[PDB]
Amino acid sequence: AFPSPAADYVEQRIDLNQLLIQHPSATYFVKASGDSMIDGGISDGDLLIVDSAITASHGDIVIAAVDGEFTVKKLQLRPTVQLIPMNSAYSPITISSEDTLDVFGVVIHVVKAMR
Amino acid sequence: AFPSPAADYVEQRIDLNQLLIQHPSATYFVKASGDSMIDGGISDGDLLIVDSAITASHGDIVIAAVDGEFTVKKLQLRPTVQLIPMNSAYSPITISSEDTLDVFGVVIHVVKAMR
């Protein structure tokens, strides 16, 4: 009951799921509290945002998965099976004999909390 | 009955709202497609995440609001009303005569899309 209501602004909305991502349910994330995958952006003080759904490509910062493993790192598996940690222990090393080495998502958005 | 710190590297549930934030509905965000508030993190290619709910403090990267304005930069209003753009056109200049200059949120998490 107003003398002349022009707009009803009492409750807005926020689509966080679509804000940082944009899928119904195909994205993965992990709290960064250490220093084993800083290559992705987790440097003991941030929030990693990976998208588990599409298949990235060798030579890209993606999360690899094997036997239930997960590590962000640009690795090549087509020419040969080799991974290269970037957080700090840079060292190109082979994993297995072409058993099961494939990325789970296709990206890793680093959320740097800046206040 | 297992008092453990955390030990968890999986989450079938996608709580994005709680993932990057942690409130029922008190956070604001804006797409970065230009170069007027890079100080916050918007550099024509990213996603800004501010929390509109608490009152930040002068000398902090927060979003200021006046008469319906929105700017990100460390400004001081207690000693004197002074604003300072940091994106690139730095220019320490006063705003008004202590009319209405106050921050809307209390933080600005920069989400750098790294793929």
Give yes or no for a contact between A100 and A67, defined as CB atoms under 8 angstroms apart: yes
> DSSP letters along B10-37, please?
--SS--HHHHH--SSS--EEEEE-SSS-
CATH assignment of the domain containing B87: 2.10.109.10
Q: Please name which of B34, B77, B46, B41 lies closest in space to residue B61, comparing C-alpha atoms.
A: B41
Across the interface, of B28, B29, B111, the residue whose CB is closest to A109 is B111
Residue type, position B18, single letter: Q
Nearest CA in chain A to B24: A14
User: In this structure, how many other beta carbons lie within 10 angstroms of the beta carbon of residue A107?
Assistant: 23
Three-class SS state of A18: helix
b/e A55-75 (16+ beta carbons within 10 angstroms → b): ebeeebbbbbbbeeebbbbbb
Give yes or no for a contact between B109 and B20, defined as CB atoms under 8 angstroms apart: yes
Question: Would residue B31 show up in a list of annotated catalytic residues for this protein?
Answer: no
Three-class SS state of B50: strand
CB proximity A40 to B under 8 Å? yes
- Alpha-carbon torsion angle B59, B62, B67, B68, nearest 10: 170
Cβ separation B56–A112 shorter than 8 A = no
Method: NMR
Instruction: In whole angstroms, give the CA distance from residue B23 to residue B25.
Output: 5
Cβ separation A19–B19 shorter than 8 A = no
Q: Which residues pair with A83 in a beta bridge?
A: A93
Instruction: In whole angstroms, give the CA distance from residue B85 to residue B39.
Output: 7
Sheet strands (E) in chain B: 28-32, 46-50, 62-65, 71-73, 82-83, 93-94, 102-103, 108-112
Q: Please name which of A43, A47, A29, A46 lies closest in space to residue A107, comparing C-alpha atoms.
A: A29
Give yes or no for a contact between A81 and A97, defined as CB atoms under 8 angstroms apart: yes
Q: What is the DSSP letter of A76?
A: B
Angle at CA of residue A91, ends A90 and A94, nearest 5°: 140
Which of these is catalytic: B25, B31, B52, B73? B73
Q: What is the DSSP letter of B43?
A: -
Cβ separation B20–A49 shorter than 8 A = yes
Give the number of domains in chain A: 1
Which H or E run includes A73?
strand A71-73
Burial class (CB in 10 A: 0-12, 13-18, 19+), A48: buried
Three-class SS state of A17: helix
In angstroms, what CA-CA distances link B93 with A75, A102, B61, B74, B98? 50, 54, 17, 13, 14
In angstroms, what CA-CA distances link A1 with A6, B29, B45? 12, 33, 45
> Which structural domain range is residue A16 located in?
1-115
